[PDB]
Amino acid sequence: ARSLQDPRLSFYCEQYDHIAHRMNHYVLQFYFEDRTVEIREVTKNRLHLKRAHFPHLNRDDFKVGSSLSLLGGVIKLTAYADEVTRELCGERGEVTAVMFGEQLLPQLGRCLAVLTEECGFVALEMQMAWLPVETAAAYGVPPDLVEGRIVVVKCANTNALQRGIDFMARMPGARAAESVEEVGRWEQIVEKAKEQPVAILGDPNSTVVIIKPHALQKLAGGVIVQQLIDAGLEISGISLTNMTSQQANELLKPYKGVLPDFPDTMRSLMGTVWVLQFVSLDEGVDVVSVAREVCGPFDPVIAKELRPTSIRARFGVDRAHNAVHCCDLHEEGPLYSNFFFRP
Amino acid sequence: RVLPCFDNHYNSGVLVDNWFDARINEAHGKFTIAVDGQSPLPSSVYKADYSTPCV
Amino acid sequence: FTLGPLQDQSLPPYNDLEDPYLAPYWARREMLIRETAE
Amino acid sequence: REAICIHIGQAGCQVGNACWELFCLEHGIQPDGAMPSDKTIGVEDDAFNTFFSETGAGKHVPRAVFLDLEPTVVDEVRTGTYRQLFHPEQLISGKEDAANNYARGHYTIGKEIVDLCLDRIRKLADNCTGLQGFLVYHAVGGGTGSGLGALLLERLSVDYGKKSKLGYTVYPSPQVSTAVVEPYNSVLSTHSLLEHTDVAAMLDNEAIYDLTRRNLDIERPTYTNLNRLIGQVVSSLTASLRFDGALNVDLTEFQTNLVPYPRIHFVLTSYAPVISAEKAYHEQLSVSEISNAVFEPASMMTKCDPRHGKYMACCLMYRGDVVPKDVNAAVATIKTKRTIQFVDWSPTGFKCGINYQPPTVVPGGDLAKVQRAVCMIANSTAIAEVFARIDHKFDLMYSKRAFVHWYVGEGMEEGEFSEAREDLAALEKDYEEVGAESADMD
Amino acid sequence: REAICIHIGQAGCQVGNACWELFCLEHGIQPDGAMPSDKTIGVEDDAFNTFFSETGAGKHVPRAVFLDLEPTVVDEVRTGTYRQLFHPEQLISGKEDAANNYARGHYTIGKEIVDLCLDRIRKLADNCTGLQGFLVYHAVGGGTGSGLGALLLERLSVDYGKKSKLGYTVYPSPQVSTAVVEPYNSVLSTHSLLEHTDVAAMLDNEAIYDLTRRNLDIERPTYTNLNRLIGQVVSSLTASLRFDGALNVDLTEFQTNLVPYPRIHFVLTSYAPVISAEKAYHEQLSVSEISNAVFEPASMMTKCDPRHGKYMACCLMYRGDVVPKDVNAAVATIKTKRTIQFVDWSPTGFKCGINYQPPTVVPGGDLAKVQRAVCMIANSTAIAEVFARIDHKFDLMYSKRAFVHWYVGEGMEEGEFSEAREDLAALEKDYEEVGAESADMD
Amino acid sequence: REIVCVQAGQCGNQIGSKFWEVISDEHGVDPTGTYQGDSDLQLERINVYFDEATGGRYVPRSVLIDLEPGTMDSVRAGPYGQIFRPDNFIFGQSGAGNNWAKGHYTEGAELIDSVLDVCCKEAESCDCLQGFQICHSLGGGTGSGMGTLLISKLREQYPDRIMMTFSIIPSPKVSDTVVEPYNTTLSVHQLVENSDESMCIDNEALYDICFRTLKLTTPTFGDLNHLVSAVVSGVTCCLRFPGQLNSDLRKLAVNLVPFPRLHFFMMGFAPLTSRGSQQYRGLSVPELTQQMFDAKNMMQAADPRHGRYLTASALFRGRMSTKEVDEQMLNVQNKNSSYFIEWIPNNIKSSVCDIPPKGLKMAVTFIGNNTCIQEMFRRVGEQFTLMFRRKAFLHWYTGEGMDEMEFTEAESNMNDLVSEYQQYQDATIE
């Protein structure tokens, strides 16, 4: 085929250039009938990437305010470029925001499970915020949730507001925005938290776990979080960031010469990932040992044969795609936390 | 350079002589040098270029 | 009286050998060599 | 990159209406000249540039002139639906027709109008940066098409020189006829076209009527159908300049590959999947079936039988979903056939092109929607039979000077008839000599 | 320590706008004359003092005068964005222009305005403790720049005496031209400028247009681009007084090293890393590459070809991350080249300077950001070609007294034309005689 | 730098009404005189053409003179007529009768003193006075005689300023009056001595502009006077708006006039195009440059291809590059080198102004000094010699009081002007 009048979706996009320290703006076109992408420059009307096939993309991935991985780089979709994509991509991109309170962190895994795999909300923004009383009052948090950590999630689904109200009614404790201005203020909250997040720094008894994108596509993140919490760990820190290939190389440099599938493991960390930091309130619990015992062997077949209840035996498919990456030494906690949370 | 020397009895609508120009002229109206209206004048080059630089 | 095509409207490069206003200079140099010898 | 279109006379302007309708619909330009409001995203692509130029406000305007001596057809364009598409200066019209006299167009009336036309073409050529040829549409059966087409080709050939000139020409059909004096105009026109054209495409109305009756299911066809088929052929040949593809073909490549000797430049044209929607769903349309179709005499748009001659060169353009290995397998199968013959001095007889853009469907059209199509232009000695039959009708009429007094009254010497008849005799002898085997000549 | 800048007429004021924009952004002074509250802390510094003075409340004010006879350009600076930076007394404007007449500026109109200029320069010179020269920017093509610039330089030369005066001068381009009377004004200006200037740098707009087309990718440049390039050159030459370096160069060293005889003081100028942001990150820009760059005539900011003459002295200023060993290796490689030739009486042809401050980047600018740059000013006999074409144009026009009645009516004796033309003839003979080989005396 | 305008006679008053309408429109002045503009760039040079009256009002610095008040009642009745100061209308009680001698000697000397009092009152109010601008026809009666009388008096009283004139001259084909040669010859004799710069316009050229370029079906004198008002308002644009390369009337004179008698110029204005065609072609410096030298857009019947350019000037308005202007002027000089006088190394002056006329992105006005102007004077001299040999209508002029020696002097002076242009046309370097 390769026709020029075939249906497509158009967006304006942004991508940071780490070499020139400059921001670039493009126009992205996605022909969903055959999974091909073309990119053009806004400034001088120059071609950037010829029409090429990408088999790992899908129609559900392209949403406003989302991020994609393309040839190892991260690209951000914040626009609508014509009316046709406004008609097609609308009705499934309404934005709602959900906040969580202190008393419901110990059941946060089931909260994310009911949020994602049963209420139908797919979401990429998730952070933990601690605010002073005056700023919290100004931004408009509920009064009963002041003086505590809060997790704000920016969801997207059809009929977002009414479904969010239904989610409020279904499980107690959560709060959701009831108007557009509340949504805007909570988006400001999550951006401000992104400018300076909250976590414990310099603690030798800490552990950081990353959840791979293919695990998220199967809607298994909440169950993984709940299983980690159940083992005797307290959550302190949450984030949703997109990491590029250079960041993956810098994070995984000590492994160069250990893993037998290093470039394939590097590719598995591209996309949207969740970041979890765990600490223990008892000095008699070593977080790294229990985290690694729960995670299991890094080879999914060995994990299935020997430790059938492990996370990797539950959600792994191959050595490169083992659904979790966790710290393996007793000194890596501060380094991982500094990498993932220091501004 | 010569002047027109033909007498046109008919009106615009009959395809003789200058019907196209007659139709356009009766469509628009009076004659002005200006093409567009209600547009602000651009600023000078010095004002546009030498602005307050970013800190 | 023609302005020519658009693609030939650009700046011609300067070549001082073919500049019509510098011919006496080159003639002066060509005389100057023999003047120096004598 | 760019191409300029010159339309002369009635057939050429009417075929131009269908051509520009098709090029607009393929690029997506609206009849007013602007892209649709729900499709303007801020940036676009250069493919239109071959046929349109933008002013800067985003209106598109086409690289064409319409030339006629009678006002009616151009006044229909000025008052029709595409009024806003064309620039008004491009539509040039005289006061009175050439009355089926080549002499009247060439000597009496066209001499006054030709200099304004040359000024318009010059004004177009100055606003280009990669002009690569002229496309000309005219009929040689009528007076103004023959006379003014010849005069304008002569002036263009002196002023622009090396630039290529490709002609699409409607010749007099072998039994369908419209005017009595057609043989005289066609002989004297053909004399001028021999010296001043690089490739000449031959068309016969009787072939396009037969093709529309047999393949399509139309019992009562009219000129709009023929003009839409011609527009499809021109779109297929020019697609190589406008869209991405595996094997592109520039207009200079046609002349190098198709013309063996400087006089042997008359080519036959054919198109494969002319098919209706009801037949299209009963049949698959693979590469090998349409490749076999273009060589059958039922597919041609000119009334000649290629079985009475030998092919010298073929240029095959595939557009749509085709893969090069299938084109190679098809061409290898054609070479095996015994009813297809090539001159022994042309061992590599084929040129291929592969483009991804499938053929466009026009809202009121009669062609079905198909995933692939192939168009062929070929040089063959069979065309000598077409000239001989016009020459026979000329000989019958000229033996009694049946209408000559009109031509001599409008300014022509009687000697010009004998010169043109001798030039066509020499062209027939060239096609006889070029086809003689070297094995018999040793 | 201190330097005073004198800007005359339209070109000089517009180039001044770009220069002061750059000096503000490099030191960090805001357009209102202050500095941010956090830029005061740190080590105690004063490098701005060469160009700014503080009142004590922390406002900065610059050591410059802007001179014009028409109000428009000075009213534009007075009403623009930098209104609070300049002292209102500093912006001096007359009522009416010199109308491209050197005589009107020198005899009739500049004599009334000159005493205010001298009073302002005196008020500046009283507020200094280490004045080391005057910098002058003007164009010799216009009436007020030539006439008032000459009259003011004569008065300054009498009052201040030995203090140095370095000029940046815009000469008439060899084929691009803006006014008919340019030859008369340039000859009459050059006659006065010969006696009262220590080094004169020549610029031509045609060279900066060529440089902006070849290196940058700008199809339609305007004067703001040229003025920003000139500002970069001035910043490079004055950086040696303001920042730390391995080999410093005081403003007196240019005059001592570049001028062999008191009339031979006209120098050529060029700048190396003129490059666009998109090209800069695909290539390294080592010392040897930019050193090789400064010698091609395509890099020069004056339209002359140095291959038709011999160099007498070169001064190379390096700023940024450069190491002396690379400068020595580069200069030895240049000395090896066969297309670079020095007069045999100048065996030790080079002066070097090395400064640590890299060039600043301006928000609206078109140059990329780079870690190192080199700028060269050099004295060469090729400059004799520039005077010969102006002198020929004067001879062509003066043979018929084409415009002389304006000059004689506005107050000038006809004898002044012959005197100036004879002085320029003697300057041409000086450049002819100095370039004569000393070899073969026996 | 203030200009004082003088409009004399029917043609002058009619052209003046449209000129002051165009100037009031660009600066946003209502016909009541109130400023209603929308940018400070409009106010900062309002003084150049308007004086400020109390409580907001602006008044235009113009003197209206005529011998019969019919035209003045028509201009006072017009849509912008109220803006004019009542004391500035000066009129007599009997017409010029199409006779130069009446306008110069009998009613001229009677009214001229009141006009000089008004012109001095207007001149001495300016803080700095720039040149005068005068519009009149040379073929009429009060325009030629009283205009040249006033020009002579102002040249006596203000010899150091500039004197600029816009003048309408009789077509060779469209005559409106039988005695045109006498009035034209005497007026040209007065102008060549008194004037500093004179522009000439043929009504035939404005008709050809309207029919060929604008394709107007039924043009009227309002269209011709609008084209003239547009070009008149364009020459002064650099005096009253900022720009990259400022220019001035004195600087134009210095670059255009090689010798003091050679001060007669051709005029043109470039962006002319019909309402149907305008959607098909965008403005750009090449298009304006191509139209600017096309003789179709030049306002006199003589054609440039029969002569040579001594000098020319182009003033550009709009945001545009200087490189394209310089390279266009070089390209036109290099390709058509035979049409430029060879003993001047560069014949074209350019100037650039930031603010275009309202409704146009860019515009240029062209002033040309071309030897083909000699053809108009030769035609007037032939018709004069045919009429003078037979004393065809001379008794009217002699009855007013003129001596016959003035006619022979004026004929000799015009013949010498034609000879001087012809000599510079055929000059060579040798």
Ligand SMILES: Nc1nc2c(ncn2[C@@H]2O[C@H](COP(=O)(O)OP(=O)(O)OP(=O)(O)O)[C@@H](O)[C@H]2O)c(=O)[nH]1
């Ligand atoms: N296919 C096709 N053939 C046409 C068309 N119009 C005319 N013809 C044929 O072309 C021949 C007539 O040529 P014309 O175009 O009418 O001649 P002309 O150019 O008008 O010359 P004049 O009669 O002198 O004005 C006949 O054989 C017609 O059948 C058309 O629109 N399509």
Ligand SMILES: Nc1nc2c(ncn2[C@@H]2O[C@H](COP(=O)(O)OP(=O)(O)OP(=O)(O)O)[C@@H](O)[C@H]2O)c(=O)[nH]1
């Ligand atoms: N590089 C550069 N050249 C300029 C600039 N402004 C004017 N010029 C050039 O300098 C010459 C004109 O000199 P002007 O400065 O306008 O003359 P002037 O000093 O105003 O003299 P008067 O006209 O009598 O007032 C022309 O060659 C212009 O191209 C500028 O800002 N930068």
Ligand SMILES: Nc1nc2c(ncn2[C@@H]2O[C@H](COP(=O)(O)OP(=O)(O)O)[C@@H](O)[C@H]2O)c(=O)[nH]1
């Ligand atoms: N272009 C133009 N010409 C005019 C106008 N009014 C009159 N004329 C011409 O000027 C000449 C008549 O001169 P006129 O003004 O009556 O002379 P006066 O009697 O001295 O004022 C004739 O050639 C008229 O065609 C006008 O509004 N515009």
Ligand SMILES: [Mg+2]
């Ligand atoms: Mg016809």
Ligand SMILES: [Mg+2]
């Ligand atoms: Mg000036």
